[PDB]
Amino acid sequence: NQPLPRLTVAPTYDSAMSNWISTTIAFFIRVVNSVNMTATVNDLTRRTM
Amino acid sequence: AAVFGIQLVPKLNTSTTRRTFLPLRFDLLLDRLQSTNLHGVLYRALDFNPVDRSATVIQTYPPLNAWSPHHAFIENPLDYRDWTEFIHDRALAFVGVLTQRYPLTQNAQRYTNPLVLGAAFGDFLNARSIDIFLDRLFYDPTQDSPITAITKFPYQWTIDSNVTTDSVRTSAGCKYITLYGYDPSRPSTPATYGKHRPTYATVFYYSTLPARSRLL
Amino acid sequence: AQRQFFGLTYNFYGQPAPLFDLNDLQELAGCYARPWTSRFSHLAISTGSLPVWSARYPSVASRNIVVNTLLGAHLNPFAGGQITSHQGITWRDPVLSSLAPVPAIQPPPVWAVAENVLLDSNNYPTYVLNLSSMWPINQDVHIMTMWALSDQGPIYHLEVPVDPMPAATTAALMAYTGVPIAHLAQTAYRFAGQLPQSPDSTMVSTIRWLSAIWFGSLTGRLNRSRTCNGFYFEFAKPALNPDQAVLKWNDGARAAPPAAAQSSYIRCISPHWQHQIVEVAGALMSQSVTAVTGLPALIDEATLPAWSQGVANLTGNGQGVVPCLDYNPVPMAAARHLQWRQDGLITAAQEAQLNNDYTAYALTIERHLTAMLVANPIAAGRMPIQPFNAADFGQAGQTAAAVALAQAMFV
């Protein structure tokens, strides 16, 4: 938790929430570019993901 | 005697005096940072492999130990190669930012503030605006080291350095950063203690004892 | 907040066990409710509204004097470390929420009947670890230790910063004007008895200033004419029970601020205190302050009972001490009147009567305590009246000294 800000806010990419979305979305990007995935699932489609 | 599984030898022996806390002058801080090799001066590879310039873990000192990396640095860690390079760069490029706001020649004989200097440098690495920290990068030994952080300003917003009237909530340092290729698996790697992590602690600095009760 | 209090239990006046009946434990600390911040729920706007006469507790202060004894027998934790139990009774849990009959299969080690045991809010590592919750037990042991360190009247504390009343302290008081001394200690007590409040908190200054003004009034000085920042207490005209006190913001000459920090420990000295709802609500209130602020310093040793010497953390003798004065309601009021008489407040022939009026009053709250004293012995294992020997009543204690400590406190 952080103290309420009395200025102007702009979606920041720091913070547990934000980081949690960034590392986890970084994990499933690894699940998609992994051995298993890479051999089965098509190629160009796997890029789209 | 023995406490649980640990056995304690009879003789009691402790240091008998304490060195008066000495605050680093502004010039020394400037040389420590702008030295040929930062290794030893600032950071120090705990187990640097001779064969190849590789280090599993690196224990760090003062103006660096304060710093706590942002997510992008943890994920995809660097090798002891670009690590020395990263710092040998940023340590220098930081001295710039800080020295252009305080020309050394005129004000070098002024003690930097242990605390702010830490957050001011750690925030610089994470690439966060360092404007605010500079305002009070110094402090007269008479005013408490943690007091100048409050007296100068009760700024409760800057993430990782919330200064209230009596306390300064900052994220503990990281006495250990782990360069890519580190694993707590091997019994050989130096005991990092989890500090290789960014947020494992939360150092709350307090001004007075009543200020501390209110904290606890 | 504040995490450190040192207490001292009552003295089993030349008696065996703690002078409190089982009938008492279920009369104050009973009903299972937390016997803590209850001390005050036994006082009224005055005395004529309480069962404080011929009865189980024949005194406007006979309650606290009992609940205080009862607290001594159940505070072993702060003495040693464990909970213990005194006569089939021991706190239900580690938080000492309340008292209750010893379990049945896992009973606490029977307490050790010992008198005047010191206390350290440290000897009980759980206390501070919960602070917030059992906060009350602090302010209470404090109320205790301020009556225990004494034998004839509680020993509170007085102050007066060299500065003017803390604005939000002249605003907080101006909303307690008509209110009687009783309901003032009320808020005072009720306040510093729940949720650790920082000594910095507004209320502490206000309720600490309300204990400095009350004193100035009790010694003429801060009268209807010479007010503090605008306040002073007006006592009921003796002839219809002068044992009153109401805060009254006026607008007469403001008693100029003292030339320095004026600190001193003052305690009522004659038995009279035991029945004057104002000599208790006032003293009790001045203690509300100390409770949430540790203890100014060490209370002077000199004038004090025999069981209160060098009482670690409490009593003193050296430098960290503050001369402790003790006044007597009558020798007091007399001067309190003379003061009024000098400030033209009253006629020159009205003070030689005001005393008659009040002096006869004190002679009434005297043939009553003596009666209750020679009614509730003490060898009867109880102490609702607290022994005093028909003597202290006239005892012209410090008095003259505190009458001067009042002037320097409100120059």
Per the CB < 8 A criterion, the answer to whether C66 and C24 are in contact is yes
- The total of other beta-carbon atoms located within 10 Å of residue B150's CB is 21
Best mutation target among B68, B70, B71, B155 (most A Cβ atoms within 10 Å) is B71
- Rg (C-alpha) for chain A, rounded Å, is 17
| C378: Cβ contacts below 8 Å, ≥ 6 apart | C13, C15, C19, C387
- Looking at the structure of chain C, the number of domains it has is 2
Distance (Å, whole) CA B205 – CA B171: 11
Question: CA-to-CA distance for B186 and B104, rounded, in angstroms?
Answer: 46
- Judging by beta carbons within 10 Å of its beta carbon (0-12, 13-18, 19+), is residue C121 exposed, middle or buried? buried
Chains contacting B (3 or more CB pairs within 8 Å):
A, C
Work out the minimum CA distance from C106 to partner chain B, whole angstroms.
28
CB contact under 8 A, B156 and A3: yes
Same-domain status, C320 and C335: no
Q: Which of A2, A14, A17, A33 to mutate to test the interface with B (most CBs of B within 10 A)?
A: A14
C359 plus C320 within the same structural domain: no
Instruction: Tell me the C-alpha distance between A36 and A30, whole Å.
Output: 11
For residue C337, the enclosing domain spans 328-380
Q: Give the minimum alpha-carbon distance from B208 to chain C in angstroms, rounded to a whole number.
A: 12
Q: Write out residues 245-274 of C within 8 Å (CB-CB) of B.
A: none
Whether C212 and C337 share a structural domain: no
Residue B46 buriedness (CB in 10 A; 0-12 / 13-18 / 19+): middle
Distance set, CA B80 to CA B123, B173, B198, C93 (Å)? 22, 20, 19, 57
CATH of the domain at C359: 1.10.287.1520
Alpha-carbon distance C3 to nearest alpha carbon in chain B (angstroms): 7
**Cα angle C55, C56, C61; round to 5:** 90
The tokens describing C4, both together, are: 């450190």
Give the count of Cβ contacts less than 8 A between chain A and B: 14
Q: Please give the residue of chain C at the shortest CA–CA distance from B208.
A: C1
Give whole-number Cα distances, C105 to B152, C77, C102, in Å: 61, 21, 9
Instruction: Inspect the interface and report whether the beta carbons of C2 and B216 lie closer than 8 Å.
Output: no
Instruction: Give the nearest chain B residue to A6 (CA atoms).
Output: B157
Which spans in C245-368 are helix H?
Answer: 277-291, 329-342, 351-362, 364-367
| C12 and C27 both lie in a single domain | yes
CB C8 within 8 A of CB C71: no
Judged by CB atoms closer than 8 Å, whether chains meet at B70 and A23 is answered as no
Experimental method: cryo-EM
Chain C residues with beta carbon closer than 8 angstroms to that of B215: none
Please indicate, yes or no, whether residues C375 and C229 belong to a single structural domain of this protein: no
The verdict on C228 and C266 lying in the same domain is: yes
Interface test with C, best of B213, B214, B215, B216 (most C CBs within 10 A): B213
Resolution in units of Å: 3.3
Minimum distance, in Å, between the CA of residue B71 and any CA atom of chain A: 7
Pairwise CB contact (< 8 Å): A19 & B71:
yes
CA angle A24, A28, A29 (to 5 degrees): 110
> Distance between CA atoms of C401 and C324, rounded to whole angstroms?
10
- Subunits that touch chain A (at least 3 Cβ pairs < 8 angstroms)? B
Contact of B58 with B179, CB cutoff 8 Å:
yes
| Shortest alpha-carbon distance between residue B200 and chain A (Å) | 13
Instruction: Tell me the shortest Cα–Cα distance from A5 to chain B, in angstroms.
Output: 7
A33 to chain B, any CB pair closer than 8 A? The answer is no
Residues C119 and C311: beta-carbon distance below 8 Å: no
C339 and C195 share one domain: no
Pairing mode, strands C246-247 and C265-268: unpaired
Task: Please list, in sequence order, all residues whose beta carbon lies within 8 angstroms of the beta carbon of residue C151, skipping any fewer than 6 positions away.
Answer: C11, C305
| Measured distance CA(C256)–CA(C233) in Å, rounded | 17
CB under 8 Å to B67, separation ≥6 — which residues?
A: B60, B118, B121, B122, B125, B126, B173, B174
Nearest to B205 by CA among B180, B168, B163: B168
| Residues of B with Cβ-Cβ distance to C1 under 8 angstroms | 210, 213-214
Residue B210 to residue C2, Cβ atoms within 8 A: yes
Could A14 and B70 be called an inter-chain contact, meaning their C-beta atoms sit closer than 8 Å? yes
Cβ under 8 Å to B: C residues 107-146: 131
Determine, for residues C3 and B214 on separate chains, whether the beta-carbon distance falls below 8 Å.
no
Does C48 share its domain with C85? Answer: yes
d(CA C211, CA A4): 39
Please, which residues have CB within 8 angstroms of residue C227's CB and are 6 or more apart in sequence? C249, C250, C251, C252, C253, C254, C255
Which residues 197-216 in chain B show a CB within 8 A of chain C? Answer: 210, 213-214, 216
Binding-face residues of B in 156-195 toward A, CB within 8 A: 156-157, 159, 162
Our answer on whether C and A touch (3+ beta-carbon pairs < 8 Å) is no
C174 and C321 housed in the same domain: yes
Are residues C26 and C38 located together in one domain of the fold? yes
At A34, the amino acid letter reads S
Beta-carbon contacts below 8 Å between B and C: 14
Same domain, C290 and C339: no
Whether residue C317 sits in one domain with residue C223 = yes
What does the alpha-carbon distance between residue C153 and residue C321 come to, in Å, rounded to a whole number?
20
